[PDB]
From a paper:
Highly polymorphic class I molecules encoded by the major histocompatibility complex ([name]) are crucial in the adaptive immune response to viruses and some intracellular bacteria, binding peptides inside the cell and presenting them on the cell surface to CD8 T lymphocytes. In contrast, chicken TAP genes are highly polymorphic, with each haplotype encoding a TAP molecule with a peptide-translocation specificity matching the peptide-binding specificity of the dominantly expressed class I molecule encoded by the BF2 gene, with the BF1 gene expressed poorly or not at all. In this paper, we find that two other haplotypes known to confer resistance to Marek's disease also have low cell surface expression and promiscuous peptide motifs, and examine the structural basis for promiscuous binding in three low expressing molecules. Second, we show that peptide-binding repertoire and level of cell surface expression are inversely correlated in both chickens and humans, indicating that this relationship is a fundamental property of class I molecules.
Crystal structures, based on heavy chain and β2-microglobulin (β2m) expressed in bacteria and refolded with synthetic peptides, showed that BF2*2101 remodels the binding site to accommodate two peptides with completely different sequences, including the anchor residues. Small residues bordering the groove lead to a large cavity in the middle of the groove, within which Asp24 and Arg9 can move, creating different configurations, as illustrated for the 11mer peptide GHAEEYGAETL and the 10mer peptide REVDEQLLSV. In BF2*2101, small residues like Gly68(human position 69), Ser69(70), Ser97(99), and Gly152(155) create a big cavity in the centre of the binding groove, allowing Asp24 and Arg9 to move. However, the two structures with the 10mers TAGQEDYDRL and TAGQSNYDRL display a completely different mode of binding, for which the P2 Ala does not interact with the [name] molecule at all (and therefore is not an anchor residue), with Arg9 interacting as a bridge between Asp24 and Pc-2 Asp. A further mode of binding is shown by the 10mer YELDEKFDRL, for which both anchor residues at positions P2 and Pc-2 are acidic. In this structure, the P2 Glu interacts with both Asp24 and Arg9, and Pc-2 Asp interacts with Arg9. These various modes of binding are presumably just a few out of many and illustrate the promiscuous binding of BF2*2101, unlike anything seen for mammalian class I molecules. In this article, we confirm and extend the finding that BF2*2101 binds 10mer and 11mer peptides with three anchor positions, with many different amino acids with different chemical characteristics, mostly charged and polar at positions P2 and Pc-2 (and hydrophobic at Pc), which is unlike any mammalian molecule described thus far. The structural analysis of BF2*2101 showed that this low expressing class I molecule achieves promiscuous binding by remodelling the peptide binding site in a way never described for a mammalian class I molecule.
Author numbering:
A (entry chain C): 1 to 10
B (entry chain A): 1 to 278
C (entry chain B): 2 to 51, 53 to 98
Write the structure that this text describes.
Amino acid sequence: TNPESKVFYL
Amino acid sequence: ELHTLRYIRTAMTDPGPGLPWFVDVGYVDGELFMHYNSTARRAVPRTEWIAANTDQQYWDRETQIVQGSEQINRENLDILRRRYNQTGGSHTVQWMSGCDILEDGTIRGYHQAAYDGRDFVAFDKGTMTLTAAVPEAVPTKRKWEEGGYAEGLKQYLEETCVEWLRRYVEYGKAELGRRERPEVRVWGKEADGILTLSCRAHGFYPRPIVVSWLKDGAVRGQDAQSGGIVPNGDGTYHTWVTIDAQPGDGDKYQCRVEHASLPQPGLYSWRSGGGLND
Amino acid sequence: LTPKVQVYSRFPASAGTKNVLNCFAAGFHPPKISITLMKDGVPMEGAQYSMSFNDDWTFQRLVHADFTPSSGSTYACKVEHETLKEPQVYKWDPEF
């Protein structure tokens, strides 16, 4: 499964 | 027993014409299975083994989480442009995520990002903190320390991503384990006193292959030039290996093909000729 | 980074037989690339594309189209990039 949207914040 | 999982994201400012700005592709042992684009806005299956083992509820959840990251990567292109003091042009935000289950049993999880090709941030497992490569990646670590996103990423890379990968291998046990024999063709071309002998392998699975040229039954690794393993539209692979020789010596040269589908290394000649010599 | 492009067919070349003409470009940045398959200097009909990248952040793209090899007809692949200045065209040979 793809990672959660929260772990892509920069 | 080496199994790999990879989810690669790309955020683009210039796609350009008739192309998606956000692209998310999923892989199981190199094979494509998951696809997402900013135009379609939906997570769709590519190979038959995933669709046969997953319901719509799975793909509905897979759509929204990537749709959420699409909006996050949209604003990330603007935040990172202000840090470097850029008005606009061609800027790219790349992302690498997934797990690697080693043959022994060790779990290796990766989570990293890159801005304009060069490295930006990377997650460390043995420290549970986000590592900043560039001086512009310092405010990113401050954001990660504020929200505490590392805790949710730790349980994913160690359990969630691992548990699903074990299932993906079992679901595509017949497709990934299947071997495909390649159609070999040996050619030659004369230019200016030199004969360029070519060897091409058409459609083979898996990706690893050893294609080397021989002279009088002896390997010539230095003189032979390879174009690398290139993929086909159907999922199969192709390879191109060339060698330079004197005119009237072409028949003395042999093409050696080492593949999982073949029990012994296949030896092919120009006048034989190629793969149809059985 | 300049793209490393090569033109190749899916199945071995045969006269009056259907085949797929592939053109794979790898090791390039920015991701904006113009890959077009040609027949006698004229773009080929029904061209389909694949965006992906390697572990070393270098981009890759495959452009493929269904075709029939004809005698006296030349097949090529035109690649346009900002690092190239002049477009590099790779010629496809049926017996090479």
